[PDB]
Amino acid sequence: SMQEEDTFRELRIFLRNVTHRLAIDKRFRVFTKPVDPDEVPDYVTVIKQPMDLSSVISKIDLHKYLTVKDYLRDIDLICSNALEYNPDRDPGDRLIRHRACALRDTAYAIIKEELDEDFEQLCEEIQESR
Numbered sequence: 001s002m003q004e005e006d007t008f009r010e011l012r013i014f015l016r017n018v019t020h021r022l023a024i025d026k027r028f029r030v031f032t033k034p035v036d037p038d039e040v041p042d043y044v045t046v047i048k049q050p051m052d053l054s055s056v057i058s059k060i061d062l063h064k065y066l067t068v069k070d071y072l073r074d075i076d077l078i079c080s081n082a083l084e085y086n087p088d089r090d091p092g093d094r095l096i097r098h099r100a101c102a103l104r105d106t107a108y109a110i111i112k113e114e115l116d117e118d119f120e121q122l123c124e125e126i127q128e129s130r
């Protein structure tokens with residue numbers, strides 16, 4: 001229905017705003033664009049599902065997210081990709097891991113404060129109906 005289309009449009013507006021807020025944070029610059037393969041040639045070797053905030057915007061705009069749960073799966077992938085690719089004790093790896101945990105924690109905290117649970121439940125019920 002047009003009411004269900006309106007629901008998913010509201011979802012996309014909400015997710016674009018959360019993603020924009022993460023992308024303008026200087027801590028998260030490293031997560032804003034895909035890893036340049038020249039600069040890091042073994043990335044795509046090790047990381048099977050690369051994810052970054054520009055890709056998330058692209059996926060919103062392609063109507064790939066029908067629930068906030070599906071969006072948080074891609075945020076969780078940005079974090080787990082960084083924990084897997086940068087596991088060492090050296091400060092460069094520890095800094096990226098801390099920034100990745102902070103991205104994830106920030107996205108979850110914005111959604112805890114600003115997503116209505118009944119709006120999420122509606123999206124989940126429309127998604128399950130297809």
Ligand SMILES: O=C1CC(I)=CC=N1
Nearest residue numbers: 030035082085086096
């Ligand atoms: O080693 C890296 C680089 C980048 I850019 C993102 C995640 N891990």
Ligand SMILES: O=C1CC(I)=CC=N1
Nearest residue numbers: 044045046047048084
């Ligand atoms: O880095 C990886 C992880 C997995 I699971 C399969 C292949 N490469």
Ligand SMILES: [Cl-]
Nearest residue numbers: 026027029095
């Ligand atoms: Cl830095």
